[PDB]
Design a protein around this ligand. Structure first.
Ligand SMILES: *Cc1cc2c(nc3c(=O)[nH]c(=O)nc-3n2C[C@H](O)[C@H](O)[C@H](O)COP(=O)(O)OP(=O)(O)OC[C@H]2O[C@@H](n3cnc4c(N)ncnc43)[C@H](O)[C@@H]2O)c(*)c1C
Ligand SMILES: *Cc1cc2c(nc3c(=O)[nH]c(=O)nc-3n2C[C@H](O)[C@H](O)[C@H](O)COP(=O)(O)OP(=O)(O)OC[C@H]2O[C@@H](n3cnc4c(N)ncnc43)[C@H](O)[C@@H]2O)c(*)c1C
Lengths: 493, 493
């Protein structure tokens, strides 16, 4: 059943934290709905009484969107996690409170199916889907939103009336706009999503629920490279080769689209760089492409990696390559920035990166992660979904995590220093339409709002949404005219 | 709904692996029941046709019990994971397919409750509960079976008729025996459990559902000690002090029972030892006991630890200290042995341990884990439940994990060499009734069946069940007269 957790309830303390402990969520109360109807009734009460609301699914927000500005009510959606066949026609319905782990297990166990969900199994569908969603399978399957068929969402009209509407991929008029806005517009903007329905493009769909087939086996490999064996020149060589491989091998449908690499380029205090690579073993039984990719990175250089891994079944291999809600990632303070890369950075940029990775800094959880991108993602056009980046080949995440609030300035300083110098030639940000193509709204970065940090002249909304912002604003005016749903980086009326 | 996965189904490959990849589970088919009735109907069809059956919940078995001897049918129970208030009107019912993670989240989120479930969140309730179940909260709350109120189980009688029976803590006669047998008898022995109901002893129970209250906050700390700073003498000193602290401070109800330590005493190739400690912050707001305990271990020695951690809310803190189904623990081959310690080992034993931790061996996932024990566990008498160890103060797990089948012998050899020399004075095993008290059935060790490995004259069933074995055999004869449920270490008729 549905229940409420107030300020005096002992569970409030746990609920007041999302994953990123830099931020706190302190409403007058949390409501934990059990059904979409519970969501509607809860929102209706709140909006009628003029109370401020927000929702939360997995709590993975990189920013303080849920708890800031101060809310009277937060709807925590984790009980809405049902997964099942879609009521009408093929496809699959997923409650917005389901986590990636729950979805991956259900899709595989029930239908031998897979969607391109991310590498962190605790992420909630709510925010992940609304912002686009990419993962290890995206070079084969595209973005999660590329499989979206419908969104069921609680919305608030100009008369303060809450309705549960369902917008479908084949809708036109206002409903068509609401559907499109959820294909990358980002969470916290239009209403409270209660469920998503997924139906894959014809060329990716298989029986019996119209989703893609999970690979029978995956090659999975993790290679550790000791920093002690790497000098600046070989670092630049390895990094350049990583990017150049992607420039060549990121076309939709190519054999190389079966491979996905994640390069953890760690601060030197970690002692090592770590390359993870996976490849669909159905496509390439011997894993030849993976082996050639890995070997090519360090050939000639004096750098020798220590590999581990093997060939695993799908669910076991996926978990081997994933990050769950356990251990040192829990209860941490963190900051992350993002960039889309259309082409290799210059060698000078790679030297800047090397220099900051050797700064005197407590960097045991500080790194830049470079992920393969493109492939099937790049089959669609920039305006087909709200996500506009459809010709990038590597996606980077720039990350630091730490424990003590007293070190916030230190860690934010290191991250900002690195990102801003790396992109100094373009105002300290990865501007669109050049070697880079802006940023990903699921790694939101409030520094992009500040002229001291962003001297590019390109506003946050263009870095995240490019030319799709106008249509998003129209959808916002139409569907959330009172700006009921808002946060520091919400779509403007 | 319920479905079957046969040899030709692509999902069969994933299902053929449990957590420990040393073993394979290859039945003619897996059946995935959705309800207890599905279990009964599936078992009935199988036993009528003379087909061999076994079940699996979380897949965490340390041995090959599920897939060996060859089975015609394996019932995979993960869909039976419902959690809710007991129908009787008091307590909570938990499906046997629920994992520790599912149970911890549900108990906390719904009722601010907690049970002493283990430190690995992917373990299934099915096997965990039947074998006893201990965890970080056991010094306050006892074993999981100490909270068991009922077991709902599918059993097979002499006429090959399957019936779903519910045996309760207040039952007498045959049902009383069936209930008692599930309080430590171990999984795979009596029938297929479909659900457990939990109701805490009066002194531990709270509103609203008769379970214990989850602590408001936990002190959590992880301390890393570099092997480079530790010589044999200081190693022995640290280990001795760890054990002596527990000899003094493991009485039921003491302030020190709010503390739980896990000491990962790693092979030298890992470079470090790691001590984890948590303490109930409601009991000890300043965490003085924790701070004193940690300081005492290395006082005098030249060993300096590097601490991290803090004070966290219950669910976040529990996850911070826990191991989930992700990363390097996935897809691995492993072997584990166990021992109950009633008193400190001799310094000579601790020197043996030191020597093997320095052996030329690939030991990056080889370690001995020492866990705080006793406290509330030790309130009950040895015959009150099927678990007989009720006066131990430290529990150890002796572990190695690796990837390649070709190294099975190497790793088994290292682990056997260490355990057998450490316990050489008592036949190579932790005999009962001395400095040690035998072994834990949830870390089953088939080596205890071989005279080359066990020269103590104490058979496996006495090491695990001591004087409770006779009553277990009687229950087995009564409730599984055809030996439908059996494996390499199952209770004998
Ligand atoms: C922490 C983390 C995030 C990751 C990780 N790995 C990713 C990957 O491999 N691929 C990716 O595409 N993204 C990865 N991400 C990022 C997540 O995609 C984002 O952090 C998501 O936005 C998280 O979603 P969720 O966990 O639901 O976050 P919340 O904090 O609950 O909400 C974020 C934001 O969205 C709004 N919102 C949530 N739910 C709804 C619904 N139901 N309807 C409307 N709006 C919703 C919130 O109010 C808030 O505004 C790996 C890691 C470790
Ligand atoms: C892998 C692993 C195990 C751990 C870990 N941490 C523990 C902890 O902190 N405290 C503990 O008390 N135990 C810990 N364990 C050990 C687990 O407790 C044992 O490994 C359990 O037996 C695992 O249970 P489960 O995951 O359900 O294992 P299975 O392999 O499915 O079954 C084992 C055994 O039991 C029978 N069985 C399962 N289900 C039932 C039902 N419903 N009814 C009767 N019999 C059942 C199986 O047939 C098999 O014989 C940490 C880690 C990483």
């Amino acid at each position: 059943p549905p229940f409420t957790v107030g300020r005096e309830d002992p569970r409030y303390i746990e609920l007041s934290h999302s994953d990123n402990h830099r931020f706190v969520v302190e409403p007058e109360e949390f409501f934990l709905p059990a059904t979409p109807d519970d969501v509607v009734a809860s929102l209706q009460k709140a909006v009628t009484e003029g109370r401020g609301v927000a929702c939360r699914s997995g709590g993975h927000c990189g920013q303080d969107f849920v708890g800031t500005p101060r809310r009277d009510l937060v709807l925590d959606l984790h009980n809405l996690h049902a997964i099942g066949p879609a009521a009408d026609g093929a496809g699959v319905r997923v409650g917005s409170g389901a986590t990636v782990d729950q979805v991956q297990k259900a899709l595989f166990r029930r239908w031998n199916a897979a969607l391109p969900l991310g590498a962190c199994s605790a992420v909630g569908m709510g925010g992940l889907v609304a912002g686009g969603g990419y993962g290890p399978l995206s070079r084969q399957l595209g973005l999660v939103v590329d499989h979206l068929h419908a969104v069921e969402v609680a919305v608030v009209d100009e008369s303060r009336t809450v309705r549960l509407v369902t917008a479908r991929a084949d809708d036109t008029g206002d409903l068509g706009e609401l559907f499109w806005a959820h294909t990358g517009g980002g969470g916290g903007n239009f209403g409270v999503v209660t469920a998503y329905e997924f139906r894959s493009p014809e060329h990716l769909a298989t029986e019996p629920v119209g989703l893609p087939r999970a690979a029978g086996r995956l090659h999975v490999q993790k290679v550790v490279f000791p920093w002690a064996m790497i000098d600046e020149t070989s670092f630049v060589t390895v990094m350049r080769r990583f990017f150049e491989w992607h420039e060549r091998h990121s076309e939709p449908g190519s054999p190389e689209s079966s491979l996905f690499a994640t390069f953890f380029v760690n601060h030197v205090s970690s002692g090592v760089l770590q390359l993870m690579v996976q490849q669909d073993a159905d496509v390439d039984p011997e894993g030849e492409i993976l082996a050639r990719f890995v070997a090519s990175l360090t050939e000639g250089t004096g750098v020798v990696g220590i590999p581990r891994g093997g060939v695993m079944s799908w669910l076991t291999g996926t978990r081997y390559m994933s990050q769950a809600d356990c251990g040192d990632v829990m209860g941490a303070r963190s900051a992350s920035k993002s960039a889309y890369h259309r082409a290799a950075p210059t060698d000078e940029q790679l030297s800047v990166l090397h220099r900051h990775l050797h700064a005197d800094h407590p960097g045991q959880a500080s790194y830049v992660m470079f992920n393969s991108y493109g492939g099937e993602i790049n089959r669609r056009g920039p305006s087909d979904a709200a996500v506009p980046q459809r010709d990038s080949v590597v996606k980077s995440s720039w990350f630091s995590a730490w424990q003590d609030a007293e070190l916030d300035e230190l860690h934010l300083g290191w991250l900002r220093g690195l990102y801003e110098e790396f992109f100094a030639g373009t105002g300290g940000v990865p501007v669109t339409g050049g070697r880079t193509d802006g940023c990903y709204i699921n790694y939101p970065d409030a520094d992009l709002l500040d002229p001291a940090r962003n001297r590019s002249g390109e506003p946050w909304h263009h870095l995240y949404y490019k030319d799709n912002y106008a249509r998003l604003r129209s959808a916002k005016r139409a569907w959330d005219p009172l700006n009921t749903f808002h946060h520091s980086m919400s779509i403007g009326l």
